[PDB]
Amino acid sequence: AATGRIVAVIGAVVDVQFDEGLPPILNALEVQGRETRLVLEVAQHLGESTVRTIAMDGTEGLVRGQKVLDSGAPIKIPVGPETLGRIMNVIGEPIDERGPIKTKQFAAIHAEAPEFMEMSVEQEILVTGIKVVDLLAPYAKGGKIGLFGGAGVGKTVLIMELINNVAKAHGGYSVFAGVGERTREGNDLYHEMIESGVINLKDATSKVALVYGQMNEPPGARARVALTGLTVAEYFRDQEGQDVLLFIDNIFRFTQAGSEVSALLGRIPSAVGYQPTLATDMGTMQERITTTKKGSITSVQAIYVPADDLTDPAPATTFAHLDATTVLSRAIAELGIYPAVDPLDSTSRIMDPNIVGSEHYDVARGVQKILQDYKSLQDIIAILGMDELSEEDKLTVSRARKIQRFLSQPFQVAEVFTGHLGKLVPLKETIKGFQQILAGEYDHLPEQAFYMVGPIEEAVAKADKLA
Amino acid sequence: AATGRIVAVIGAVVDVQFDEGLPPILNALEVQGRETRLVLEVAQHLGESTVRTIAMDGTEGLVRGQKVLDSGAPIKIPVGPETLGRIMNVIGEPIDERGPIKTKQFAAIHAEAPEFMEMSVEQEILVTGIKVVDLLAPYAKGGKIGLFGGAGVGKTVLIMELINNVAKAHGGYSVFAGVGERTREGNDLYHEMIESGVINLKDATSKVALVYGQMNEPPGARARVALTGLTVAEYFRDQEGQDVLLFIDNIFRFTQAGSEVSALLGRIPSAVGYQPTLATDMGTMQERITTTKKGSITSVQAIYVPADDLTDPAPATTFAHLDATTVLSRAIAELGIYPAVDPLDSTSRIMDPNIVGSEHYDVARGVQKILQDYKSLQDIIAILGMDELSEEDKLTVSRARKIQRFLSQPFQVAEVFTGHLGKLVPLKETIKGFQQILAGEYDHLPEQAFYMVGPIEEAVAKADKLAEEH
Amino acid sequence: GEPIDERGPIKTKQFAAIHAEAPEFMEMSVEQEILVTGIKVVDLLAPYAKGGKIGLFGGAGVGKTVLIMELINNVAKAHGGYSVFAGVGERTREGNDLYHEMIESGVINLKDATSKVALVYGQMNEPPGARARVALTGLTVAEYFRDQEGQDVLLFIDNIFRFTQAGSEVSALLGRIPSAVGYQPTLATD
Amino acid sequence: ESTTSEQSARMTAMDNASKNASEMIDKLTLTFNRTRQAVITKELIEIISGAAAL
Amino acid sequence: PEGVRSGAGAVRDAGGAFGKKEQAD
Amino acid sequence: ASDAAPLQYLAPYSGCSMGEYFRDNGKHALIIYDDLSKQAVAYRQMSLLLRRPPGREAYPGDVFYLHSRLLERAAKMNDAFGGGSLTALPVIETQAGDVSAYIPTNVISITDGQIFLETELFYKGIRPAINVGLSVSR
Amino acid sequence: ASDAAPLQYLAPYSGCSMGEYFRDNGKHALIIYDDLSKQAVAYRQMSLLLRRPPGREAYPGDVFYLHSRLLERAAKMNDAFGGGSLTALPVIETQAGDVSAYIPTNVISITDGQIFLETELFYKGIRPAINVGLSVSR
Amino acid sequence: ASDAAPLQYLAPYSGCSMGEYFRDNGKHALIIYDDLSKQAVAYRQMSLLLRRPPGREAYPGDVFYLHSRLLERAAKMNDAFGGGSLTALPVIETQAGDVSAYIPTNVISITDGQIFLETELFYKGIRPAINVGLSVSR
């Protein structure tokens, strides 16, 4: 439509000058004279017919005076029912060496959040087969879920266990978006999805689509992948009536990548070096992943905490965008309890008697009270010792130490490097097993018998063998 | 005699350009074309015929190019004996809806401090009726007093009881200034002083003048009301040879107000986000509250400590300007002892054997020694139980606990809270009661008899009733 | 490099600059050896390494100066080497005491050519730029004995910490953004 | 017979308690030092940032 | 002098378990 | 959370101005500001983009005056003006139970009282988790 | 140490390219980076003199990308591309065994396993001093 | 405190120059500096208003050089110069007994000993409250 000239190149920020026809904000531009396609996005209007842009690829080899062409619309990607079983990238180009993607229509990345009158307020429960989540902080259908944890504590093993347990039996479609992670894990996921049968290469019976931008990409790309996943997630919700599952890995890299360019744009840093616009641009992205009167979306997101700190500005503003929280701890993982879920720091919105029933709620509140009481005796035990306690305190210590063991469980996806067998518990058995321990029926068993088992019946047999 | 134009409005800072004459620093300017009165004060000369000013009210509705006039002198306020029983503004305007203040004189709020050869060397005790103050940290006539404390420990109740006890029995006049506080309390004080007869709406026998600027005002006004308050008192000290009283509530807001405009004036911040001109600005104002050879001023000031931290730069640089300090603590208040005065962190300058005698001095030092010795015994009790202690340690603890209770006292302005009538205790009973407890003449009584009483004669009468009701 | 002891000019034959470069890769020794001092405890439990660095944790009242002078004497007797002393941020009173203490022991002689130590002083009341270059002045003197005569040398430094502080003040004066805990950004390369 | 055993047990208990206290006071010091450095760095950055924006 | 030095009454100032245990007795 | 920062900055005053209508006509009203902590972040974002110097934690220099002029508008009028009233109930959130932070200490010293909630009492079966040893009402 | 900072910042990529030569020609190679912490320190020195906003521990905000690029260039090619390989063993030093710092945690989230060496075992005599409880390979 | 900053910055040198007169004429003198911290605050104010780069706790880079010059003019002269003397006793105030702040660490490193005073010994009867454990003269 119109042509410009490059005036300055610094890192991942480029400025262009237009003689006539100044493009509007959020439009895409094309660079002339390169082997591979390179696209720029307009961000600011400076003045004197100049704009400041952000690149989506490497910017080595650019010379002042080079030509830039205008397109006239934002970034558009192919969307439809033929994206199932394929692999895309930031700007919607196939990277699975299988030819072009022949869809009928396209869609733009940037849109607006659903209005106030389109919200739904129904609530139900989702069963995962994991004791801690079902007993303490159950999930829901059409809600947001977050997994907090440090480095090396096990977020992605839990995400793969949830995929294995829930995704297979689902009747709808699924979307997996990977942002700022390892490439070899993506290759492993692709090959195991080929083996299982979710991806079929000889017909049209696939039920998953993949979008990837990993940690080897410049910061411009990593700041835009999640919206590329969101668009293909939203098409299946609006145009078709379907239930969609969306998995996002380390949405924290969406925030970090945005602060690597804030300095180059000429802004004053706010706190701990972060950009001043940290909550608004997160709120813009998060409000689109919702459930409306046309469909449902269930979200599972993994979040990262720098230097094992929960007061950092990045993970401290995500608590307000969730309906269920699961917090992982390194100290529990040191003691050998897997999964390392903190039972005194996880919440859910549907833990009330009128939804889950009275019995479940009473059992959960009793186990939480018992767990809280044992934590307040640590200082005395750590110095004076166990002998100073009375009988009731010793009894509470023994029961709390027995309860802690029974919360661990073996996973099926970890059988390869643990030498065990996976287990899957129904809800009623967990409720009854915790009731029986609370009632004191198993005070004559050693505390080492409640370690890494499934239903309660396996504890008595392992205790019987370990005479 | 000069006229200017507004060229910039940012926040609460305005810039004016003059074409004929340049007003000096610390001058008052008046804006033309508003229904109310807006006043600007000059701060800096920026060159090229421009000044940078600070507003004393809201700045909404201003338009670039609006005319401004020059008055030719600093802020001037009415002063004299016709301002008794009236409420006035930062710039001297009635706010009690009773007509104008008709005096014959005016004064400028920016003056200079007295010199070295005008100071006085006099020290006499001033009895108040409170046991802790009269025993461990006496006050002096013509001295400076500070009341340090955090949020919610009792500064305002104490400063009200000081007024109720000292002000009414005083021949001279009094001034009260409110800086950056709640309006709801300023409504309470006004109606309290009418019932007591100190303020009269019909006769001409008032004794108090009031100046108010509260926390709903822009930072420009909150940083000047104290000078307006002390300018009134200087008149009653110099032009008339009479003793005056001066009460100030939260002088801390005078410093906080100056930190909200320093950045807009183009300054590099100092430590913990304070302006680089803290100590000098505090010192310039504080030096004017003194008792020279022409009159006497007795001042009481309330100081706020943020987050119970006494190392903060605002309260840290205030200890040097005082003669007696009382420190309120939150730990003591949680035991239920009021007033929550810390007995091991209060000081006075006239606590000397040659000024208060030997008996009074020995009693206070003996109390402080046993209160210090009590602390060390509480570490042993944590590990080994109470009963393994020797009998001498048990006697020491029993005496210390009884000494601690006897320092509490019911006030008269707190009858709604506690539900008891107030008490006043002279000095001799205060000395004798502690001397007897230190001797050991009341080792056969329970602790509860020494809680919330006046003299020593009432504790045994309380114990007898407790025995009768058992 | 001018005398401050009121005895006259230092008449020599050559001059050298204080800014130089480290020896190349092909001039290093590929073996490690031991320097023997003649003290039982050091030579038995914590031997010194030839061409190495030693850290001396200590203070006052535990005989530090006697140890310094005894090392100065022993290395000159058993091997035939000279020594250099450098005081970075030196108090004047202690430097006068040290100067007068070295004369009576015999390591400095005022009557003939028998001295063994050369002293370089940078005192506390000098600008920060001056207190950051004294160590290179003390190193340049010993490099002559090493290269032009082929002998072994000993070098002492009063305090290595004040060398860091003096260099930390210059960066602040030149207007550079401070690093962690208020140190210069070039802490490791200096 | 009983008194001697009581004394000989109390001595061992009072030895183990001091061992545990010595173990705790060693981690608390390292935590204190790290926090002390972090406070200085955080308070210097603010002054630099507020000086640059003028 | 450089390190952390304790004083008298530090057990009851922290307000941990031992302080309340001391108070109730 | 999807609206622009100026709207979140302007919202509480727009509601106080609606509450003041009843106060001046002899009627009584109640107002609630949910999460006052989230207005200060929008004010800080709006001020920084206007090239104003930062302060502590990059907050503007007058965050105290932002709330002081807001919480002073609730009052009880006498009979000459009608007898109306207006009541306020702000809300604040703290990080890891730290009440001695920057923002909370400002708003503690303005109001007439406070109610404290704790997690340890929440998990011990005490619901609602009101700490009666610290809550006060002046 | 005597070399300038940019030379201590360019070094690893230069070795990585020489290693990548073999990987694409059907051969196998191994590379050992002695210390990435000193490279991080050198990069921090370079950044501050360019007057860029500091962050945690005065490190720039692009430290993660600096190592993420480097350690992603070791892979195992398939048969159609030749079958070569490249293996990497980075080394990092800690202070008083603090593994919850910025750079050590940053690097752990990149590699595929870690080996822990303790000092108490080294002092008591166990050499090599490997903590079997913590060391892991995926 | 009512005087300008430059006078509070010039005061100690003027008093040292008066005492240096006795030292050069065979007599002895003694000088006492009260509150050396307030001179440093007065000096910091001018440097902050003159647009010089700040440092740790906003002090300028040549604050150590300001106090090292002052305290190096006390000496004992030999017989050729007469035999005079000059002795100094500076005073410094600490916050919460913290001896690792910026200015006390500077001043402790220049002088020849310290006399430490405490408040716990004051209220148990030991007056003057001198702590013999942490006091020394070299």
Ligand SMILES: Nc1ncnc2c1ncn2[C@@H]1O[C@H](COP(=O)(O)OP(=O)(O)O)[C@@H](O)[C@H]1O
């Ligand atoms: N359920 C589990 N059972 C056994 N080991 C586990 C489990 N979860 C995590 N781990 C340990 O954690 C490591 C993987 O961590 P990872 O899931 O990659 O952490 P993150 O998700 O934070 O990157 C494995 O090597 C394994 O030893």
Ligand SMILES: Nc1ncnc2c1ncn2[C@@H]1O[C@H](COP(=O)(O)OP(=O)(O)O)[C@@H](O)[C@H]1O
């Ligand atoms: N005898 C007493 N003296 C002082 N304060 C008391 C007394 N009895 C109860 N209090 C409580 O102490 C609180 C102190 O309030 P106030 O003086 O307004 O705090 P501040 O000192 O912060 O101004 C009052 O709310 C009151 O409930």
Ligand SMILES: [Mg+2]
């Ligand atoms: Mg992972």
Ligand SMILES: [Mg+2]
């Ligand atoms: Mg008050």
